[PDB]
Amino acid sequence: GKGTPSFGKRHNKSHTLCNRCGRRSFHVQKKTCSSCGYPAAKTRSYNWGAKAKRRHTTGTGRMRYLKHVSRRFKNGFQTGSASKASA
Amino acid sequence: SEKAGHQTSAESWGTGRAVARIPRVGGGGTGRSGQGAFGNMCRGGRMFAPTK
Amino acid sequence: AAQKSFRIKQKMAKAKKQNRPLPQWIRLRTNNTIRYNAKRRNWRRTKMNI
Amino acid sequence: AKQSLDVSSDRRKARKAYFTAPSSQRRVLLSAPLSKELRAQYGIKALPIRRDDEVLVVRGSKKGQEGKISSVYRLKFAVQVDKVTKEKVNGASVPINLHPSKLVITKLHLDKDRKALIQRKGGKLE
Amino acid sequence: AGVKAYELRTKSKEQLASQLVDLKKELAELKVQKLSRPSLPKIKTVRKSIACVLTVINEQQREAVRQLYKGKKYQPKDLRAKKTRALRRALTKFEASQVTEKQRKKQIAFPQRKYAIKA
RNA sequence: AAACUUUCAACAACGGAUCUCUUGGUUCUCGCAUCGAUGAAGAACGCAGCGAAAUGCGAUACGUAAUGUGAAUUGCAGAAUUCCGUGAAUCAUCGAAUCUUUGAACGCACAUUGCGCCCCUUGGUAUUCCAGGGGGCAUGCCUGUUUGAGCGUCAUUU
RNA sequence: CGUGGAGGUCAGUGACGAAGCCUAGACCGUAAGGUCGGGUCGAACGGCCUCUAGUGCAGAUCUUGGUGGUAGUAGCAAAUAUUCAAAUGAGAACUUUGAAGACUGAAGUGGGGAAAGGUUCCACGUCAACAGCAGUUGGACGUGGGUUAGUCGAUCCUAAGAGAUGGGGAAGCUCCGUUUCAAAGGCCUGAUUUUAUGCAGGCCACCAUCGAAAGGGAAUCCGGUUAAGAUUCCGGAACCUGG
RNA sequence: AUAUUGGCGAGAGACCGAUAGCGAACAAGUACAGUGAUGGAAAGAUGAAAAGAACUUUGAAAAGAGAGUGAAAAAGUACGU
RNA sequence: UUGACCUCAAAUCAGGUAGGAGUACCCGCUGAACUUAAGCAUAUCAAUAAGCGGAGGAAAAGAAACCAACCGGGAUUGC
């Protein structure tokens, strides 16, 4: 029937490199994603199981603005300025 | 823990070639030479009497 | 071949710098216990396939 | 004493301010005392170490020799010796890693860095 | 070397303009000598000077906006900041308790008189 | 009278238990309320004199500015004199800026830094095309200024 | 009875060497064991009276890692063929150069593209692992360089196909259809160069987008140079479109 | 007042002590493999100071046999035991 | 052969609003299987697991068409 190939004559990229994330999981045909939701407002990130959750949360990356959080209101809505006092 | 050993659920082979019950971890030569969790087998100890 | 695109090729253009690990100075640094990195690859015989 | 709030009575949870200690305070960790003469002249014994000051070795393996503070280490918590230098394989300078706390200071350098600061750091200067 | 930062805040927008050009030619002359010698005499002190100039100039162009637009509820969306959403919404120090003739009897007209339970 | 095999007390390979430890990680109280259109999080494309791999950062790209501390760090190189007090500092602190191509991320798309228009300024001695820099525009509700159909209903002049 | 761990005590022991391992060294006990010496090693150790229960071990096709007998073993047969000389080297049946003898006989191991792959091509240097014999060569490793376009493509357009607004279900997350009751789009001219444009006639039914690297299609070939690659640079000879 | 497994700041403790505890104390949503949703590794330890090996003999290189350094070279880039 | 009020629209302006991630706990709506079973349905598991949306910084609920037959009772939730 096959002759021999099952993964033989393979030369057509199915899931292309996802521009949204980069996990390579999107096709032009069905126009749907399998990483974090592509053309739509959806986001493939659920909470089932004891795993596969933190990779869509926070704490494991950059958080360039979340560092500005734990910073400002440590005193009391500081949005003004300051100067010298004791050298 | 409610997630100690609660993170593995696969299926291995049966009759034929010489192979015991080890959840065939995907990828040939990935270090996980037939591992998982479950009870007192796969590389992941078990804890009798769940501490209430 | 070569012909593809940029956006796809851009994401695949970074392993060129992975061809240059430790010259003659990284071997002895500040409290370094990890010498060579285990992320090297040469696809002459290696089959990464992303 | 465990009574207030900011207090760690645990062994393992008392070395957090060592490996991740602020470099602005890591130098304070590498301080140096004085002697039995400058104690009744300055009052304060614990003083910040300085590159422009000398020191004498009492322990270690070089008794009767003095050293000069040059390059200091904070990641390894040590300091090289400018004066007392050994020989490598040809005869140059061996990075003798010591510490100013285990060494007795004999001479200093009276500037305005102290005196007035001593009044701020609690004391009565000279 | 290491330049200053107070010498740039005392100059006008014209003096800093010509000074910026002088730093432009400094870049092309501090990148050539690198393929030959392994280290350049002044390679570190080149990204600290220009970075300080652009900071002062941009600051002086924003403080002038707070001059003619001062004293109005309609200032351009660039004088304030990001802040948060809670302050822009929620209750206030007046809308939380609309002082009138009826609500006055709740807290203002009838508050809480002090007392000392003893004898 | 030897070599080899099994049982083999020391030395010398391959293989690399157990015990003695640590800057960290699972069950639980109290206190605090600091995410969210002046642009979040994650990922990709990157950055230092020898920077490939983290963190941080986003053509001011392992910083700048301000405050506090008050006289460095590194394996090596380079090194000005502000070094007895208009500010060293890879740590810490950090109210005011900046942040591309993607992304709850905006003219319209993405296997494609894809594909247009309007306004302002300079040159090609041309208000119309092209190029560079800066600044914008899309849909479903609830108010409002300047403005349009429809003899459904309802009025005023010879 | 032993091991791990907590509390109390002999205010114990502890570089005059703890604990752990080996010991064809000894004593006591019916059986579970402990102490001493030597060697190795150089940092906190042990007993009794209690408490705690994830402490002891030949097998559940038990889990993971490592090591033998077999064994200096089987195998090393698809595709006719090796040998001599020279250079280099400690070292050569096999890499380089030259010669002789041959295989494949454009339906081949040729010479040009697409897909996959993005530094595996070119230059220099090196031989510790891998490259199941050998191998100074190499698709192993380290240090560099090359990426130049109005024109052959792609982008633009269309069929198949995917997919909005204006409607029509559902609690939410959405699907199908592609014009199935339109108030969808705003231009030529007249009154207006210097008004960035307000009121009336006379017209046009097209009126989200994406969608082929073998098809569709106004435009450039040849020759030479370099360590590598052009129709791109240099030199010579021409044409078309828009403003 | 009452609730409070994720974020921030002390003791979170009569736990375990690297085949154990969560998947992760290290590069840790790691490496490798796959068209996708996933499963998910193996390896903790030098010394006060790398002084990480002067010089000489044999050898093409990597080594061994001396010597020097160190409390011990019975710690020699295969790391305390 | 001539001007107003109401309803129904159309922009790029001053001044506003909308589309989500994480998500312990809690709330509204919709909706399964396996275990046990003196056989099977009913029932238990279960106003559940998983998934989605909105609001809050605790949420839901709660200052009475409520709870009693007594000595009349004096808001909600939780141990």
Contacts of C30 in chain D (CB under 8 A): 75
d(CA A55, CA A65): 18
C31 lies within 8 A of chain D by CB: yes
Interface check for B8 against chain A (CB to CB < 8 A): the answer is no
Amino acid at E14: E
- Asked if strand I comes closer than 7 Å to A46 Cβ, the answer is yes
Cα separation, E67 vs A64, in Å, equals: 32
B7 contacts on A by Cβ (under 8 Å): 49-51
What type of residue is D62? K
Touching subunits for chain B (3+ Cβ pairs under 8 A): A
Beta carbons of A20 and A44 less than 8 angstroms apart = no
Contacting subunits of C (3+ beta carbon pairs below 8 A): A, D
One-letter amino acid at E99 equals V
Residues ≥6 apart with Cβ < 8 Å to B39: B5, B46
CB neighbours of A13 closer than 8 A, spacing ≥ 6? none
CA angle in degrees (0–180, nearest 5) for E96-E98-E100: 160
Any idea which residue has 């005193």 for tokens?
A75
Give the residue nearest to nucleotide H53 (CA to C1').
D89
Q: Which chains touch D (3 or more CB pairs under 8 A)?
A: C
Burial E27-54 (b: 16+ CB within 10 A, else e): eeebeeeeeeeeeeeeeeebeebbebbe
Residues 6+ apart with CB under 8 A from D92: D85
Å separating the CA of residue A15 from the C1' of nucleotide F45: 20
Q: Which residue of B has its CA nearest to A51?
A: B7
Residue D98 pairs with which residues in a beta bridge? D79
Paired strand residues for D57: D65, D103
C to A contact (≥3 Cβ pairs closer than 8 Å): yes
Looking at the 3D structure of chain D, how many domains does it have? 1
Instruction: Report yes or no: C18 and C40 within 8 Å, Cβ to Cβ.
Output: yes
- Residue A64 CA: distances (Å) to CA of A37, A61, A68, C10, D123: 23, 9, 7, 24, 45
Helix (H, G, I), strand (E, B) or coil at E19: helix
- Residue window 8-27, chain A: list those with CB within 8 Å of chain B: none
Q: How far is the CA of A43 from the C1' of G183 (A)?
A: 39
Chain A residue with minimum CA distance to E87: A77
How far apart, in whole angstroms, are the C-alpha atoms of residue D97 and residue E83? 50
Cα-flanking dihedrals φ and ψ of residue E90, to 5°? Answer: 55, -165
Note the residue count of chain D.
126
Q: How far is CA D122 from the centre of its chain?
A: 19
Instruction: Judge whether A12 is annotated as a binding position.
Output: no
Find the CATH number of the domain harbouring D83.
2.30.30.30
| Strand H-contacting residues in B 22-51, CB cut-off 7 angstroms | 23, 25-32, 35-37, 43-47
Q: Identify the contact set of chain D against chain C, taking CB-CB distances under 8 A.
A: 75-76
Interface probe, candidates B1, B2, B7, chain A, greatest A C-beta count within 10 A: B7
Q: How far is CA D50 from CA D1, D43, D108, in A?
A: 33, 19, 9
CA distance D49 to D113: 12
Q: Distance between CA E65 and CA A80 in Å, rounded? A: 17
Domain that holds residue D98: 1-126
Instruction: With CA atoms as reference, report the closest residue to E53 among E90, E106, E9, E87.
Output: E9
Domain E74-119 annotated CATH 3.30.1380.10: no
CB atoms within 10 A of CB B7: 14
**Residues of chain E found within 8 Å of residue A79, distances taken between Cβ atoms:** 81, 83
CB within 8 Å: A49 and B7: yes
> Are E81 and A79 inside 8 Å of each other by CB?
yes
Method used to solve the structure: cryo-EM
A28 touches strand H (CB under 7 A): no
Number of neighbours of residue D72 by Cβ within 10 angstroms: 17
Nucleotides in chain G with any atom closer than 7 Å to protein CB: 54, 60-65, 113-120, 139-144, 153, 162-163, 173-175, 213
Structure tokens at D91: 């005869």
- E74 sits within 7 Å of strand I by its CB: yes
- Give chain E's length: 119
CA distance linking residue E53 with residue A52, whole number of Å: 48
Q: Which positions ≥6 away from D58 have C-beta within 8 Å? A: D102, D103, D104
Token output for A85: 């006092």
User: In the complex, which nucleotide's C1' lies nearest to the CA atom of residue E1?
Assistant: F80
Determine if residue A21 is labeled as part of a ligand binding site.
yes
Q: In what order do the strands lie in the sheet with D65-73?
A: D78-81, D65-73, D54-57, D103-104
Element spanning D57, H or E:
strand D54-57
H helix or E strand, kind and range, residue E18 = helix E15-29
Q: State how far the Cα of E4 lies from the Cα of E49, in Å rounded to an integer.
A: 8
Q: For residue E15, give both structure tokens.
A: 């003096």
**Would you put residue E43 in left (φ > 0), alpha (ψ -120 to 50) or beta?**
alpha
CA of C34 to C1' of H80 (A): 19
Q: Which two tokens stand for residue A78?
A: 């500081």
| Domains of chain E by residue range | 1-73, 74-119
